[PDB]
Symmetry: C3
């Protein structure tokens, strides 16, 4: 039961839902069909539960990486935009909303890491990673540092690692090959070796986490930091004069940060598929549609070419998109769990000097496969719980038989 | 040993063993070689144990789906019938007795699901699934229901599911591809959606089992049911005027029921491999041979073209074969274990409404891998135990080092 | 830290380390670079532990089968010999030091099983397996047996099993295909059948192990035994007049023993990679180089063609190489643990009569998969433990960097 004759939308609380409701208000005045916008707690946890039974919203807004799991479960419907509508959004975004060859969601916003520099300390940010060590010595004389960013999470260190030919899984033929991992290749080796060399030459500290990195830049202690659009608001409050720009190149190659895409998916159980399509394609994914949402709570860089060109007058939003286009799209597959587990360990152990770069990255392959087994066990036993509960109910009972 | 100079045959207690003994008695009169026919308890469980050590029968008669496990273990011999003898049996039946490319048994009988209708209530049975919802309303005016069949086991519901393009595993070039599963495709999806649509529209009950469906047809409460030849004798006692016909077509395409094939395999440890070929090919697999078995206990439809055409004068035996030819053969691979587990839950959850058809069939892949892991865990520890004794017991201990 | 400017070598205690040190001394006299040769206890277990952290020796010497694991962990560097140097060694040996398509070590010495016969009892050794049952009946009349070897280990029985077309894994394009297992094909079946046929015809005993086999040949109770070079010293002491020859052919096909290659690998963490290449290629892998090592403790057959020709004037060393050249190199992959586990059981069960050849060899496929399961099972929990305790490592390090990060500046 989702109610035929109306649309119900689920979007997270930190987004411009009131602005989205104004698009749904515009939709009513034209079609006479009422659009409700709901923003429930942990909707990402709730959606798989309710949609499995045939309930939940008509449309759901979330990051694309979580949509891979929804489509695996058959909770999302295959969308049908034509060639001409597909030309409206940046071609690279459409690859993020693909599962099993077929398209499963509409890309809305684009999210990726950028290089954030202090304008007062550093008017000309470096274009290369290689010139940062020399730039640190020049700033250490003034009692400052060149660069401080989170080293604990692989998400932040990956841009450098992937610069030279490092990848999570090979994306070819619209499918991720899980037998083709680019974690201990030549380019990932050099990327991490540069990061470790930065640490043992005291240009960075191996223990630097998110808090330590943010607090440093916002006090004016460090000239540069690596962070996403979610951090801009806190830098605005610190009164620091900052700029957001393209990430530094390593061995002439651009940094490849992970790209997160906010996407709109249609519930497979929805009896209003065509209505949702009309809403999303012809009301929301238009200049006026995205503007209403952006004015409530900024979307950052958007998928729609026409509206992105208008936001890109903000040099920070242009930088987000530029880094995104040069970046790697976040894979939406289940194997991504084992990847994080292994690479998080790999970088920690190389940065501490516990393992060589060569041996820490080699260990990732065997460490991720090990984690896949725990997940493989996890699913097997929860299946048995269900099986026993299944029979326990019908077949032999305190008041039944077979 | 299995004794050279004679044949010993294993065949289940519910088959025409006396009739087979007669065929052995004909064999003894022509060749001077004594044939013994035995029927031990749980011979399907006993065969893998004794054949592994080199003992057991020369020939074993059983459903082909169990012969995969025997051939995998190397307990069966590669049979050598020539082209001329292979034209004597229906072409599709040979696919049932093929493991790893090699042929490993002789096809004897053919079992499959068929549509059984009540002639007095419904003289003209529906040819399409699509017209059953309309046919139910017409019968509900007389307090009766159109169709009731077992919905708990997938074996019964699969015919519909596979109708439009669903399949267990892909079968090309004589071998299954365990990576080409067709339980999540558009055809299997539409098939199961029709089954669920029937239940949500009150034409069928989601909790109808084998007992409930059989009893309803034999009392005359329902007009149609889906079942195999095994159930005919119970309908015969109920005095119900019944017929057996082709399964209804869904989306203009036939239902594809799974096909069981009673097969005769030769033991790998048998010193009488040549005598078994002579007996199975030139004595049993003839009109006269199968006649003798069929008169003791009916074989149903048979693999041999000549004797089948003779049996097809019984319209029930013609329909069993017709449904079998349109259907697919029950895969004899070990991945079938996990396949059943996943599809049984898929259908139950779709029928009860715990999962949408799409979501129910999607979870099938993840449940098949679950049963695989679970099933592979138990092969791991079984092995560890065996080793443990072997090293533990044979290799050294008090009285040794 | 491994020290740049000098070479440190790890070689097992039962090898000619003094002879190697003399090659190190020769290197020092020409180049002025000192070479230390260390022989630590259980170095094969220690090397992965220390080379992971960036320590350990510059060069390591060990059987090639263990090097695959070192390469998998990225502890070994890619060696760079040119075409002209690769012609110096036997082409087959280079396949033993290969992993992921890269070369990872220099082949030094070759080790393989051979047929060892008693000369006084049997001057003309049988060229075929098929004539051994007939030759046993002749010797039983004189109160002796024809052949006695270890039947408990698959390493010893495999030569016969592999002969007609049995293989652990298919080696093509320089890669090991783990999906193509030839343990229950027609050839391996026929081999094991002959072995089992020998036992139930009382020509061999199913309970015969390494100790029973060796002691029986050394006292002069059996005419032939199958064993490696490692056992020659014991037979020398027993005053038995013995020869080492090519293994008997089964169905006209040669017996295929597994080949062990003693190899020199360069540490990936070594700051002397170019120095180690100079040493190994131009000082050790020369007639004079291997001469010095061989005179300390014999190497057996060697990888270097030139020095092999000189050693082949020993009829025992020539036979070791002959058997090694007809046999297959032991796969350097992890899947080999499960293979030994399964084949060991297969043969034990077939020999005892517990299972038929067919049933035994078919059950090897499931027994190998079961062992593979156990291994990744114990690897997954080692992974969980390591991570689980890593959560603490962070907690403690949150109270360390917090201060120091302020001490220096603050
Ligand atoms: Zn709020
Ligand atoms: Zn809320
Ligand atoms: Zn939330
Ligand atoms: Zn520096
Ligand atoms: Zn404009
Ligand atoms: Zn008997
Ligand atoms: Zn079956
Ligand atoms: Zn013929
Ligand atoms: Zn053949
Ligand atoms: Zn209806
Ligand atoms: Zn169609
Ligand atoms: Zn075909
Ligand atoms: Zn075909
Ligand atoms: Zn296919
Ligand atoms: Zn006839
Ligand atoms: Zn006759
Ligand atoms: Zn007749
Ligand atoms: Zn067909
Ligand atoms: Zn160190
Ligand atoms: Zn000199
Ligand atoms: Zn010199
Ligand atoms: Zn020592
Ligand atoms: Zn070895
Ligand atoms: Zn080659
Ligand atoms: Zn004999
Ligand atoms: Zn012993
Ligand atoms: Zn020299
Ligand atoms: Zn010389
Ligand atoms: Zn060869
Ligand atoms: Zn804490
Ligand atoms: Zn610390």
């Amino acid at each position: 039961k989702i109610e035929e004759g109306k649309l119900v939308i689920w979007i997270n609380g930190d987004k411009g839902y009131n602005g989205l409701a104004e698009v749904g208000k515009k939709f009513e005045k034209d079609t006479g069909i009422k659009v409700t916008v709901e923003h429930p707690d942990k909707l990402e946890e709730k959606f798989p539960q309710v949609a499995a039974t045939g309930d939940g919203p008509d449309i759901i807004f979330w990051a694309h990486d979580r949509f891979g799991g929804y489509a695996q479960s058959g909770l999302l419907a295959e969308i049908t935009p034509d060639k001409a509508f597909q030309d409206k959004l940046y071609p690279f975004t459409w690859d993020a909303v693909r599962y099993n060859g077929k398209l499963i969601a509409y890309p809305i916003a684009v999210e990726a890491l950028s290089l954030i520099y202090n304008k007062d300390l550093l008017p000309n940010p470096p274009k290369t990673w290689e010139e940062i060590p020399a730039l640190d010595k020049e700033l250490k004389a003034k009692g400052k540092s060149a660069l401080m960013f989170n080293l604990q999470e692989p998400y932040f260190t990956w841009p450098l690692i992937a610069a030279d030919g490092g990848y999570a899984f090979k994306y070819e033929n619209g499918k991720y090959d899980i037998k083709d991992v680019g974690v201990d290749n030549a380019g990932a080796k050099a990327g991490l070796t540069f990061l470790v060399d930065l640490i043992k030459n005291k240009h960075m500290n191996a223990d630097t986490d998110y808090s330590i990195a943010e607090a440093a830049f916002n006090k004016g202690e460090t000239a540069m930091t690596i962070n996403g659009p979610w951090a801009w608001s806190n830098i605005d409050t610190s009164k620091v004069n900052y700029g957001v720009t393209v990430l530094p190149t390593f061995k002439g190659q651009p940094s490849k940060p992970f790209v997160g895409v906010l996407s709109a998916g249609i519930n497979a159980a929805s009896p209003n598929k065509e209505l949702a399509k009309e809403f999303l394609e012809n009301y929301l994914l238009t200049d006026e549609g995205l503007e209403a949402v952006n004015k409530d709570k900024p979307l950052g860089a958007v998928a729609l070419k026409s509206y992105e060109e208008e936001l890109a007058k903000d040099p920070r939003i242009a930088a987000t998109m530029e880094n995104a286009q040069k970046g790697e799209i976040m894979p939406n597959i289940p194997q991504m769990s084992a990847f994080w587990y292994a690479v998080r360990t790999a970088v920690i152990n190389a940065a501490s000097g516990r393992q060589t770069v060569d041996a820490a990255l080699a260990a990732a392959q065997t460490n991720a496969a090990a984690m896949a087994t725990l997940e493989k066990l996890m699913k097997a036993f929860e299946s048995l719980k269900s099986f026993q509960q299944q029979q326990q109910q019908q077949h032999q009972h305190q008041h039944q038989q077979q």
